[PDB]
Design a protein around this nucleic acid. Structure first.
Lengths: 112, 246, 77, 91, 94, 50
RNA sequence: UUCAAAUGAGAACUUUGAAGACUGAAGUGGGGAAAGGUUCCACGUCAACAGCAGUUGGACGUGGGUUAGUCGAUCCUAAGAGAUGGGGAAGCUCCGUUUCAAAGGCCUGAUUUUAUGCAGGCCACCAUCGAAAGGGAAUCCGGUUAAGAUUCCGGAACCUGGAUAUGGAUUCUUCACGGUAACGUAACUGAAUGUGGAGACGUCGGCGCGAGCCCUGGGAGGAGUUAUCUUUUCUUCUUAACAGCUUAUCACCCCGGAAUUGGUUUAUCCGGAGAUGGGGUCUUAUGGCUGGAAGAGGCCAGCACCUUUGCUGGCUCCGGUGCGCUUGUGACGGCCCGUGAAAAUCCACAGGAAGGAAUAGUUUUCAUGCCAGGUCGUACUGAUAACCGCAGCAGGUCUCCAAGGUGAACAGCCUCUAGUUGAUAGAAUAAUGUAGAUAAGGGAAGUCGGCAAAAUAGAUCCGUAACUUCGGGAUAAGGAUUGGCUCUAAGGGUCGGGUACGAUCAACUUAGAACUGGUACGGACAAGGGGAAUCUGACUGUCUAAUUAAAACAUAGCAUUGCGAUGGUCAGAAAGUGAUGUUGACGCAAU
RNA sequence: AUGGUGAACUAUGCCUGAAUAGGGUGAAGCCAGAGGAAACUCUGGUGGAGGCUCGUAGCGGUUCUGACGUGCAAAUCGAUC
């Protein structure tokens, strides 16, 4: 049957102003302001949240070791590893067929 | 008297456009060397919804010729484009939906949209959804082209004016009854303050030329001279005929 | 606000030269279900942190207290 | 259990708006909420997100199209007319 | 505590003691959810236990999403009767 | 207004220090015309308008 | 409201106790925003003020009181405002905001005459202002005052800017290894440049999981009742930021390869584009144990005693439950001619500029250690007397927390925690009033007119017409039951079976039957009157604030009209000028 | 007539925030059964749409032509809506 207030001068229920209700050691309920949740980083290609990265707020990554912010593939903390699997396939087989095109332009000289 | 409601839109205070959610100005690419001597390829990254407009937009990402980077631009999306499509742009490009060519490079009877009035204005004509112009003929000397504007007017433009192949997406839009005053409210909040419209009949002799009288009626002809003057003009303006068609 | 597990690692921080003071807390608890025992904690104060070692077997806890360095000024209980 | 007889999807509008208008909307809103085959992935995932934009949830292709339906009427005869003029010059 | 201990035996429950509608009191959705989560989850233990095979499971699973099933006991008399339909027809063909 | 600007708070403090009556020894002075403090302000009577 | 006591010269009104009540947690409580400005607090005093009184006071005289690296501002941008360059204007000044502009300072190489010349390359975003509710670096518990605290005290953390030292790691394969893979880890080089993520976003609906609250059983204490009954009724058993370790939906990898198609959600979506199945990776909101941290806080008992007061022991434990309530969150679904901010800021990746191992050379994104963290705000009310209404005015004014019962319910009524008991009083009970009730018989005969009052009312079962745009009309109209007690029935769970049954735990739901009574039972509260037509506007919606809420305005729908930009409609005094227009006929403008 | 001051009230658009018990009706979409040659129709579920509906807080201001009308109030109070 206890009731509790804001601990700050913002009376209003806005997005930053959230409250959690905490039982202190001194027996009383008291409100606790909570910070907005962290979003997982996204693949810049497929958009699916790319696993292995720690989910923090933006400036809380400046405080963290580099193993949290990365994986050990090429394009580690950036693309989702199935978007890296493709662009290796696509880089090899496009510049594969692209060699076959440049011999035909030598043959089309001597064939005509 | 008073200053009437259509005279009151010029000073543009609460009548300006509601611009917040708009992705940008949809234009074609600046006319450069690579496009007028050859073609340059982008790909369409995502085709997306623009607020206040009726037709979707596409974002195609080109490669800057003279500096290392990407540049992405806003095209009004023709119907049939899809993300992952190569979009070719230039004089030597090919005739396929979404490729922007000069108009001199396409045969007569070709359906293009977002065509330019003059070369390098980055698009004018037929930008609304479902519209297109047809190319009905050429004039290879003193170069021009004969095209049919979506209204049915026949205009003659330069042959260096680009245009993008196909019909603009968002066709069929006005087929659907709007059904309630709410859905017309959500339409014009993203456009401008035009709505709702009080009939000038229903207001006072100050508010309008149609106002006053112990009955609701106009009292003089509702067709006004083109040579009318500021604020006299309300009603059907300089009409050649009037009344239901037969 | 940290905890140490190995006894040896605790013997290091006591010499780490940032540690001016320590303390020994005695807590009487019980284990398993039935019977009690005497539990002690050693709290060494760093500059930026407070380390503690928990000794639940009193056969070890006495050999440790004598082993504390003489410079470290200990507040017992 | 078919429930309603005539009105179908427009039963949400109740008795209001008049029978024609409610029947003329029932024409389109069965098109815009319908589920279409996907010309790329080979499944039918395609649904409308907004006027003009049609999104596959399988192959993640987005496809521009008609407002209330995938392929507009006057469009399918543009990509044939464009297919014909292309071959005209290359044949 | 005595007023609530009287209800636990059913007292003060009658029609003159009811004010809100039979849904407001106990919504009919929550009852269906309970019915089905109980049915839907009893099939999953039989399939795992080998006393029903995934061909008959997949049949009963979709009957339960319609009804033909009054409660947990009717389904268990149903399986036993349905399962016994697999024995006879096989045995008769043998 | 419970969270303030310094130029306002500096003007509250000037009005707090004019808020007292005459000191008595002023009346005793030769040729004194002054009787009482005629500019006394009160938070129940006149609001100072910032 | 009342009694008594205390103060005083004086008490319906001040203070304490004793009663009696009330607001009832959508408060008459506990806090803030705008606004006020000292109203806060202490002592004195009672001329005036408090529309009676006054020893009391938001009054009067004198004083004291607001403590920050973490809370705000400060910073960023929004919608807009506004210099500069230019351009008008007799001029006050106007346009415009990157514009017809020679609009600027960086990264280090070249220097070991000395510091920065000369060097290549760059990057073209080119003022500023604009939010105490948006974005955002970081603080918690306990104690403390007459009045201040996330600021003071004690303890436990954290962030940022800067300096360098130690340990580890790496290096002879100069710039690490492991796992098939998802990826792992204490570390584990990286310039110009480029790209990607975060910041960063609508709403509704049910479903899941959490936190506080609610309910509640065993046990350890304290209080209230006891004429009788009651293993009884009430109350205390509490656990912060932070740190380390393990944990889960969704996502993913490997193996294998599916018809007898299987999996599967409350909600039918998924699979040869590789499903079920077997085994793994991952995020860590959240929960779990350990450190904080019992030494704190609380509740009990025992001793001393003008003081100051301490001292002294003990216990501070183990559990259950849910369509419960409040808020957070996750995965799904619905809706749109509506798809629901920007930026600073921070990070990763691509690239390879350079710089450096062998007699020894780095790395401050691993550990530990070291130094500094400024300026203004901080009191109190936030309203039936601190704001605005000439005032101590029944008006007006944005917001958070929210206990038990009854019940569908955040309705009404009643209570627990906290808060008041303030509004001039006393005696009498005329008329007429104002507010609230009741009436024999009749049942609008009253009146411009059923105005006003009454009747109806909740739920369960039975039953429902013309007409209709087939959606409705429909709670149509109308009928029957309802308390109490004692029973019967149906609905769930956890659990062991060699490769049919038993047991235990725990719910508010429905239906049925006997008995029962002054026929009473939605017992107070709460709670539609219904039907046959006519004129009129389709509907929802809006308007004369303070005599009109309408049949008027609006609307969808219908139709007409101008307009292809060198343009349509409009603005400006002018203009190197502006709105539609971040526009293009499925558009804009005028009806 | 000239030169100045006002959107703290109110009017309307924008930007960025916040606010809203409990019930009734039960649309698409979906599941099982029944009929039949078919197109499909009929029953039982499931779901939870609407400028739907009853009704609190909220916003209004219909009737009493109530109270008040040198008022509490230069627009308020009660019941009704």
């Amino acid at each position: 049957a206890q009731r509790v207030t804001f601990r700050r001068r913002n009376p209003y229920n806005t997005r930053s102003n959230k409250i959690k209700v905490v039982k202190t050691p001194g027996g009383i309920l008291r409100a606790q302001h909570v910070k907005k949740l962290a979003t997982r980083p996204k693949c810049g290609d497929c958009g699916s949240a790319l696993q292995g990265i720690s989910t923090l707020r933006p400036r809380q990554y400046a405080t963290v070791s580099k193993t949290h912010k990365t994986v050990s593939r090429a394009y580690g903390g950036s693309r989702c590893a199935n978007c890296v699997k493709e662009r290796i396939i696509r880089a090899f087989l496009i510049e594969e067929q692209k060699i076959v095109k440049k011999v035909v332009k030598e043959q089309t000289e001597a064939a005509k | 008297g008073r200053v009437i409601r259509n005279q009151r839109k010029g000073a543009g205070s609460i009548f300006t456009s509601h611009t917040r959610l708009r992705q940008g100005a949809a234009k074609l690419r600046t006319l450069d060397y690579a496009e007028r001597h050859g073609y340059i390829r982008g790909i369409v990254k995502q085709i997306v919804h623009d607020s206040g407009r009726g037709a979707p937009l596409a974002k195609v990402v080109f490669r800057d010729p003279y500096k290392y980077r990407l540049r992405e631009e806003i095209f009004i999306a023709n119907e049939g484009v899809h993300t992952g499509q190569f979009i070719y742009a230039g004089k030597k490009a090919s005739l396929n939906v979404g490729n922007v060519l000069p108009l001199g490079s396409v045969p007569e009877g070709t359906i293009v949209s977002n065509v330019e009035e003059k070369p390098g204005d980055r698009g004018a004509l037929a930008r609304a959804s479902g519209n297109y112009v047809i190319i009905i003929g050429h004039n290879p000397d003193e170069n021009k082209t004969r095209v049919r504007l979506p209204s049915g007017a026949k205009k003659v433009i330069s042959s260096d004016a680009r245009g993008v192949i196909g019909v603009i997406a968002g066709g069929g839009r006005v087929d659907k009854p709007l059904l309630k005053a709410g859905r017309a409210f959500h339409k014009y909040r993203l456009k401008r303050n035009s709505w709702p419209k009080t009939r000038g009949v229903a207001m006072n002799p100050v508010d309008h030329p149609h106002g006053g009288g112990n009955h609701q009626h106009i009292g003089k002809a509702s067709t006004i001279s083109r040579g009318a003057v500021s604020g006299q003009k309300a009603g059907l303006i300089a009409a050649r005929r009037t009344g239901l068609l037969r | 606000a940290r905890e140490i597990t190995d006894i040896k690692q605790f013997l290091e921080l006591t010499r780490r030269a940032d540690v001016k003071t320590a303390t020994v807390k005695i807590n009487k608890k019980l284990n398993k279900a039935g019977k009690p025992f005497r539990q002690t904690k050693f709290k060494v104060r760093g500059s930026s942190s407070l380390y503690t070692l928990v000794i639940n077997d009193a056969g070890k806890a006495k050999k440790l207290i004598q082993s504390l360095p003489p410079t470290l000024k200990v507040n017992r209980l | 259990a078919k429930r309603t007889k005539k009105v179908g999807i427009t039963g949400k509008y109740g008795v209001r708006y008049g029978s024609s208008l409610r029947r003329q909307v029932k024409k389109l809103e069965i098109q815009q909420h319908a589920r279409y085959d996907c010309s790329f992935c080979g499944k039918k995932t395609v649904k409308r997100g907004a006027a003009g934009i049609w999104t596959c949830s399988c192959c993640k292709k987005t496809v521009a199209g008609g407002a209330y339906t995938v392929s507009t009427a006057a469009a399918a005869t543009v990509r044939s007319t464009i297919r014909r003029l292309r071959e005209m010059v290359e044949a | 505590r005595a007023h609530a201990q009287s209800k636990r035996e059913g007292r003060h429950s009658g029609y003159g003691k009811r004010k809100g509608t039979r849904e407001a009191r106990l919504p009919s959705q929550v009852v269906w959810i309970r019915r089905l989560r109980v049915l839907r989850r009893l099939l999953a233990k039989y399939r795992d236990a080998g006393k029903i095979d995934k061909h008959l499971y997949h049949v009963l699973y979709k009957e339960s999403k319609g009804n033909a099933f009054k409660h947990k006991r009717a389904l268990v008399e149903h399986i036993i009767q349905a399962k016994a339909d697999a024995q006879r027809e096989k045995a008769l063909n043998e | 207004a419970a969270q303030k600007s310094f130029r306002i708070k500096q003007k509250m403090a000037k009005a707090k220090k004019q808020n007292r009556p005459l000191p008595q020894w002023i009346r005793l002075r030769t040729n004194n015309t002054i009787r009482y403090n005629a500019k006394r302000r009160n938070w129940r009577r006149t609001k100072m308008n910032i």
